């Protein structure tokens, strides 16, 4: 990940990411339609009983990215570490982990029409492709 790629994302998230945490509920739904296979199971969030747990998780994701992004420089595994927690202890297939962030992006596209430039999508896209450990 280049230092340019670091200044890009840092700002890319500044513009587009203020409300990211409110689109929790949405993206999950968007991931179920775009990738039907991600729904056949999905033991999480106790969905049948309400969008409570899933809307909250939304915030947890947006806060996670806000921080992991604000620290691309010094905490490069910030996100990789998170992926590990999900895959190993929260029993959440890392495929889902990946897609859901994709949908978060697609979901942001829907709400911020003109501010979510293709460039901004790229910056973020890159950052999100930083899921494997760095040494």
């Amino acid at each position: 990940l280049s230092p340019a790629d670091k200044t890009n994302v840092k700002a890319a998230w500044g513009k587009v990411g203020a409300h990211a945490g409110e689109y929790g509920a949405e993206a999950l739904e968007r991931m179920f339609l775009s990738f039907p296979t991600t729904k056949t199971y999905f033991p999480h969030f106790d969905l049948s009983h309400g969008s409570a747990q899933v809307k909250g998780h939304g915030k947890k994701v947006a806060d996670a990215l806000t921080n992991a992004v604000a620290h691309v420089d010094d905490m490069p595994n910030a996100l990789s570490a998170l992926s590990d927690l999900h895959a190993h202890k929260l029993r959440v297939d890392p495929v889902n982990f990946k897609l859901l962030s994709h949908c978060l992006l697609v979901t942001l596209a829907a709400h911020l029409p003109a501010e979510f430039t293709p460039a901004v999508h790229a910056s973020l896209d890159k950052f999100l492709a930083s899921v494997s450990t760095v040494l």
Partner: protein, 90 residues
């Protein structure tokens, strides 16, 4: 030439869309062949739904550029997919 404004536009996009594809790396987790298409598919459905704001002119030729854009993106999209479907069997 549907116009000019929509000529430097359609070209800037096919550009930014290229940086997206070229900056792509095939690390784990590897998403199934099928799912990948859906993503690229979702990427285009993004650009178009975006440039469909930058485009100008009359809603008659306005929706011609877009239809040409989607046509062009696929031009770069297809190489990428083949490039990936090749990584699968690889």
């Amino acid at each position: 030439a549907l116009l000019k404004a929509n000529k430097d536009l359609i070209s800037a996009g096919l550009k930014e869309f290229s940086v997206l594809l070229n900056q792509q790396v095939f690390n784990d987790p590897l998403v199934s062949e099928e799912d990948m298409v859906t993503v690229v598919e979702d990427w285009m459905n993004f650009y178009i739904n975006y440039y469909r704001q930058q485009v100008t002119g009359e809603p008659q030729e306005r929706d011609k550029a877009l239809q040409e854009l989607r046509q062009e993106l696929n031009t770069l999209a297809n190489p990428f997919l083949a490039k990936y479907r090749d990584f699968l069997k690889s």
